[PDB]
Design brief:
monomer, alpha+beta, P-30 Protein, four-stranded antiparallel sheet, three-stranded antiparallel sheet, 3 helices, 7 strands, globular, pyrrolidone carboxylic acid, protein synthesis inhibitor
Length: 118
């Protein structure tokens, strides 16, 4: 169920255009604006591929708590522009492609490490 939050915070199955307008809409649409979050990243593709980061298939142990994808993912990082962490919070989108770093609990994704997108 923390996995739920994870999906909801860091998954968008099929986005379309991953632009500023996209970030603003999807950040807002997922209650990540009160207050506005300084930086948040959304993974795309299939869930199957993400979950599998939790097994030595498509997932190598990494640092203290973590796991790191063997596979690259399409991705969109939303970064907050203009100080006020209270709406209107406007965002700047940055799409990307690389493996990703999560924390697994009961073999489920329950954290995204946003550090690698700073």
């Amino acid at each position: 169920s923390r996995y739920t939050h994870f999906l909801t915070q860091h998954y968008d199955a099929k986005p379309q255009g991953r632009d500023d307008r996209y970030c603003e809409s999807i950040m807002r649409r997922r209650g990540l604006t009160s207050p506005c979050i300084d930086i948040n990243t959304f993974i795309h593709g299939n869930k199957r591929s993400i979950k599998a980061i939790c097994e030595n298939k498509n997932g190598n142990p990494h640092r203290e708590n973590l796991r790191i994808s063997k596979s690259s993912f399409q991705v969109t990082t939303c970064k907050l522009h203009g100080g006020s962490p209270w709406p209107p919070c406007q965002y700047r989108a940055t799409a990307g492609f690389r493996n990703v770093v999560v924390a697994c609990e009961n073999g489920l994704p329950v954290h995204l490490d946003q550090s690698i997108f700073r």
